[PDB]
Amino acid sequence: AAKDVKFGNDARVKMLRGVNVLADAVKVTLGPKGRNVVLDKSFGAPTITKDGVSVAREIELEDKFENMGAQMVKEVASKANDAAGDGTTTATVLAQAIITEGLKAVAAGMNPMDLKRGIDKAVTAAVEELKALSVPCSDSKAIAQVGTISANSDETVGKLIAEAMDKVGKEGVITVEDGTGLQDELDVVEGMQFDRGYLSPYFINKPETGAVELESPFILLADKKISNIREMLPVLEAVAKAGKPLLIIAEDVEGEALATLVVNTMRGIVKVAAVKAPGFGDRRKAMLQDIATLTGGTVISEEIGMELEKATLEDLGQAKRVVINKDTTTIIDGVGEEAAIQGRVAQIRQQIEEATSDYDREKLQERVAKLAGGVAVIKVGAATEVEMKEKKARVEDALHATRAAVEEGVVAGGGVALIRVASKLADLRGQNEDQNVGIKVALRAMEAPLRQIVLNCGEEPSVVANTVKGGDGNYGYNAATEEYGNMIDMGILDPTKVTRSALQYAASVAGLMITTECMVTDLP
């Protein structure tokens, strides 16, 4: 359709007004004293949230140029949530401050391209200084503090996430889901815990629990679906000769074969039980082979060539314990070679590195946590649905912050890290004066997270920013108690990945936005 075209300072003012609207919506949540934002949902109750990415996503303005500004600065929070999962509010606070100060220098006649080059140089040096300033975060108390701070100073969430990471180890996978109670519940599972139940209700060895218990059972892995008892009849006879129980992981055991095997189960000759193979095509085979590696067995398939008729006891897998139930199944201490397990771990890690999709990579990480280590599920307990959503978002942010802490390290929180970085970058210079001014607006905008935290606390941002800049090291401002001290000692830690990602994405988008002169939108 027809277009409205704005040029120069008019377009810059409209875009900055949109950025200010989005950033003022976002930044009322920053810090521990930050407040919540209600987002109207056309389907369901409104969402009360303290995370900046949701309130950034929900912002869309009537003025098309202001809507441009809002969308472009919303990209900052979207990217910061995609990469680190935390610091979206900090990223938007940084992006707004670079844009306002960058447009001040743009209105001062300085070249926006050179300003963007200066911002990029300053933020590259800032990332280097953050990496130098960072301390690795491996101990449990530091992780608990990171999870607490990232969850609006909720010590319960931080300690629960610290315990979960301690339980599942470094290779473990932790996810957050809703709970039925009012309290946070941690559910840690070990070994293979694929979510398929028994094909028939009659396998139950323990009727008082509905769970089949198999002590040191054999494990058959059929990559094909079976409906006749003929094929594994030699295997069934060999198992009956051995006398140990047998568990089948197959694509489908149904009809005739299933009926005869449950009949043989209640006859007592074989304590057999069959369950469906997990996943779907191109994924079922890989983690079926993972189960085989864990249990020291081999998968029976037509592609690999051997049939169930020539399958023997050596072909079948081995574990010390097997638990069947309605929804899932647990295999405890599969008898497999350790070196093969680590080789499979390395292979799936290489697949993770080669994976360019979040879904495939997260499935591979889940498989790694299944075969090695454990899986933790955090049930968010809340009296109401809106508190469930708010607490779930906070726990997710805390989990992402703990993951970023172990990935890259921690720095002093509350924006003190960016303050120290900007203080260290005082002598950085560009190629010309416009680049130096861009560096200076980048350094000044690194004070924006601390200033906005103090503004949310109700104190004076200038006084506290100058006081923190006067101090050295991790000395900073406790925004909850409104005091001063070594931010590490008071447990206010920020993930280096979160702060660095927020700074980088804010700098990139903000430089691209201050470089603009003309904006072309649709007419109202």
Ligand X SMILES: Nc1ncnc2c1ncn2[C@@H]1O[C@H](COP(=O)(O)OP(=O)(O)OP(=O)(O)O)[C@@H](O)[C@H]1O
- The three-state secondary structure class of 294 is helix
The verdict on 154 binding Mg ion (CB under 5 A) reads no
Contacting ligand X within 30-69 (CB under 6 A): 30-32, 34, 51-53
User: Which one of a second copy, ligand X, Mg ion, none interacts with residue 364, CB within 5 to 8 A by kind?
Assistant: none
The verdict on 434 binding Mg ion (CB under 5 A) reads no
The verdict on 479 binding ligand X (CB under 6 A) reads yes
50 marked as part of a ligand binding site? yes
308 is written with which tokens? Answer: 């169930």
- Closer Cβ to a second copy, 45 or 242, answer by number: 45
Return phi, psi of residue 409, to 5°. 115, -175
Instruction: Fill in the per-residue mask, 267 to 296: x = in contact with a second copy (CB under 8 A), - = not in contact.
Output: ------------------x-----------
The verdict on 478 binding ligand X (CB under 6 A) reads yes
Exposed/middle/buried for residue 267 (C-beta within 10 Å: 0-12, 13-18, 19+): exposed
* CA nearest to 97, candidates 466, 406, 453: 453
The verdict on 502 binding a second copy (CB under 8 A) reads no
Rounded least distance, CB 455 to Mg ion, Å? 16
430 marked as part of a ligand binding site? no
Return phi, psi of residue 126, to 5°. -70, -40
What is the rounded distance in angstroms from the CA atom of residue 58 to the CA atom of residue 42?
A: 12
* CA nearest to 158, candidates 137, 175, 140: 140
Contacting a second copy within 160-179 (CB under 8 A): none
Rounded least distance, CB 139 to a second copy, Å? 26
- Closer Cβ to K ion, 151 or 219, answer by number: 151
Q: Are 511 and 426 in contact (CB under 8 A)?
A: no
* CA nearest to 311, candidates 245, 254, 216, 233: 233
4 is written with which tokens? Answer: 């409205």
Rounded least distance, CB 210 to K ion, Å? 42
Return phi, psi of residue 303, to 5°. -65, -45
Contacting ligand X within 341-400 (CB under 6 A): 397
Contacting Mg ion within 397-416 (CB under 5 A): 397
Q: Dihedral (C-alpha) 106, 111, 116, 117: value to the nearest 10 degrees? A: -150
* CA nearest to 234, candidates 262, 270, 200: 270
User: Which one of Mg ion, a second copy, ligand X, none interacts with residue 39, CB within 5 to 8 A by kind?
Assistant: a second copy
Rounded least distance, CB 49 to K ion, Å? 9
What is the rounded distance in angstroms from the CA atom of residue 401 to the CA atom of residue 411?
A: 12
DSSP string, 391-425: HHHHHHHHHHHHHHHHHH-EEETTTHHHHHHHHHT
The verdict on 396 binding Mg ion (CB under 5 A) reads no
Rounded least distance, CB 263 to a second copy, Å? 4
The verdict on 72 binding a second copy (CB under 8 A) reads yes
User: Which one of K ion, Mg ion, a second copy, none interacts with residue 42, CB within 5 to 8 A by kind?
Assistant: a second copy
Rounded least distance, CB 138 to a second copy, Å? 26
Among 86, 129, 223, 408, binds Mg ion (CB under 5 A): 86
Q: Are 349 and 373 in contact (CB under 8 A)?
A: no
- Closer Cβ to Mg ion, 105 or 454, answer by number: 454
Binding-site sequence positions for ATP: 29-32, 50, 86-90, 414, 478-480, 494
Binding site for ligand X (CB under 6 A): 29-32, 34, 51-53, 86-90, 149-150, 153, 397, 413-415, 449, 453, 478-480, 492, 494
**Residues comprising the binding site?**
29-32, 50, 86-90, 414, 478-480, 494
